[PDB]
């Protein structure tokens, strides 16, 4: 019956079944999902099976200065039109099939390490094209609610940085995973830390700190050493601009405690100029590749002390048994010093 | 053709701008834009006499791009 | 590329305030914003 037919919107809303108790709580899963297709897309007004040529609708109205008359394509000429439209339909589908793949993160199914691009431009014509965003954790949090039972939300942790010492992180929360990305990356750019770098490639000194139950021990390293650190630390270090560093994470391996613990330790590192100003002495760098040549790295801006720094025969500094055990050749691990890809 | 009171001269310069846009957005744009010599000289003169000197100075490049002889009156103004 | 067609300005802007309106709407016709 003609009067029982419905519009394309009504038919797709029914066939797709996007509203319903299945789609309310995700009670139904979709390995095979009906996909909406626009059937008016490649359709030309005036074109029908019979192949009639209507002047002014599907063919030009005037031909050679005279009005065209009603005509019909030959059986052969119409088969070509039908065949050409079928090929155009596979070509359209083939173009949609050709979608650029994105690189994976720490693993194929992991969100960690994936770039989200630069933060969105702020309302007042502000732009952050120089900043890159990396995901550190994507979690599904489930909240029990008074009337709606278990509800599913997303908590995302992202870090941002420009590669020149300015970097930050922020948590994002939303019901949709892409809204959490927007909130986290946009908020993080307003909570940027500045991280001082020695020669713009490493940290100024060994950093050992604990944040809650997460311990992080970082070691200053020379050029070419690379980033031999927890994969999340590697990601953050590329955003800060650190090229050479060793880090070891102990205790709880909580991504959030690790992230904010790392920024706390990198923001409280004393530079060589600060040490020289604090002690009013020269800071002299001795490099074995340069032999006994003394290289002054920082000199105090104020007066220069005349009294040598006291030489305590033995320093009362606390040592890490892990560092000492390695220097004495007593550290045996099959997992240490393994060959890995450039980081 | 001739100079006019400031009120009229401003009106003639608002039209010359709209005509200039017509030359710039022709549907023969696929073919090289044909900017007659008289049109370029007149459009430039109308901007000067209206006080839109910034627009007139910019147009001088189009005399070299299209290789159109500038008019003596335009150079003196 | 052919320019997209531009809708003309409403002919109400050409109407004089002392016109003969019955000539605009001589017979029953639907409301036309461009004509009223």
């Amino acid at each position: 019956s003609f009067f029982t037919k419905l519009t394309a919107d009504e038919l797709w809303k029914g066939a797709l079944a996007e509203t319903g108790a299945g789609a309310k709580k995700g009670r139904g899963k979709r390995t095979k999902k009906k996909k909406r297709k626009d059937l008016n897309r490649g359709q030309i007004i005036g074109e029908g099976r019979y192949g009639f040529l209507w002047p002014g609708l599907n063919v030009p109205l005037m031909k050679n200065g005279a009005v065209q008359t009603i005509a019909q394509r030959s059986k052969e000429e119409q088969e070509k039109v039908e065949a050409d439209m079928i090929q155009q339909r596979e070509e359209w589908d083939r173009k949609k099939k050709m979608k650029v793949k994105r690189e994976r993160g720490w693993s194929g199914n992991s969100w960690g390490g994936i770039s989200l691009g630069p933060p969105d431009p702020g309302p007042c014509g502000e732009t952050y094209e120089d900043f890159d965003t990396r995901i550190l954790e994507v979690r599904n949090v489930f909240t029990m609610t008074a009337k709606e039972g278990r509800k599913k939300s997303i908590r995302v942790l992202v870090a941002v940085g420009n590669g020149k010492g300015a970097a930050g992180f922020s948590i994002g929360k939303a019901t949709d995973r892409m809204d959490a990305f927007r909130k986290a990356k946009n908020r993080a750019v307003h909570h940027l830390h500045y991280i001082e770098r020695y020669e713009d490639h490493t940290i100024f000194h060994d950093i050992s700190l604990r944040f809650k139950r997460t311990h992080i021990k970082m070691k200053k390293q020379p050029k070419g050493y690379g980033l031999r650190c927890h994969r999340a630390i590697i990601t953050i270090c590329r955003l800060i601009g650190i090229k050479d560093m060793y880090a070891k994470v102990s205790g709880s391996i909580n991504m959030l405690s690790l992230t904010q613990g790392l920024f706390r330790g990198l923001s409280r590192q004393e530079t060589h100029q600060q040490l020289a100003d604090k002690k009013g002495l020269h800071v002299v760098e001795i490099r074995e590749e340069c032999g006994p040549l003394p290289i002054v790295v920082a000199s105090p801006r104020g007066p220069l002390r005349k009294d040598p720094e006291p030489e305590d025969e033995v320093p009362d500094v606390k040592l890490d048994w892990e560092d000492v055990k390695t220097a004495q050749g007593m550290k045996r691990s099959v997992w240490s010093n393994l060959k890995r890809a450039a980081t | 053709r001739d100079k006019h009171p400031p009120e009229l001269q401003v009106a003639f310069a608002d039209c010359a701008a709209d005509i200039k846009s017509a030359y710039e957005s022709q549907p023969i744009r696929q073919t090289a834009q044909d900017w007659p010599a008289t049109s370029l000289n007149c459009i430039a003169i109308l901007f000067l006499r209206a006080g839109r000197t910034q627009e007139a100075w910019k147009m001088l490049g189009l005399f070299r791009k299209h290789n159109k002889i500038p008019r003596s009156e335009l150079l003196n103004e | 590329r052919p320019p997209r067609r531009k809708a003309l300005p409403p002919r109400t802007e050409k109407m004089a305030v002392d016109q003969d309106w019955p000539s605009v709407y001589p017979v029953a016709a639907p409301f036309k914003p461009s004509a009223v």
């Binding site: 949609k96 050709m98 979608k99 650029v100 793949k101 994105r102 690189e103 994976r104 194929g108 994936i114 | 957005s25 549907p27 | 052919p2 320019p3 997209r4 067609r5 531009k6 003309l8």
Partner: peptide, 16 residues
């Protein structure tokens, strides 16, 4: 997401 997401002027009176 890693597969890819590809959902993918002048006006004239009496145009031609």
């Amino acid at each position: 997401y890693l597969s890819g997401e590809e959902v993918e002027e002048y006006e004239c009176y009496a145009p031609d």
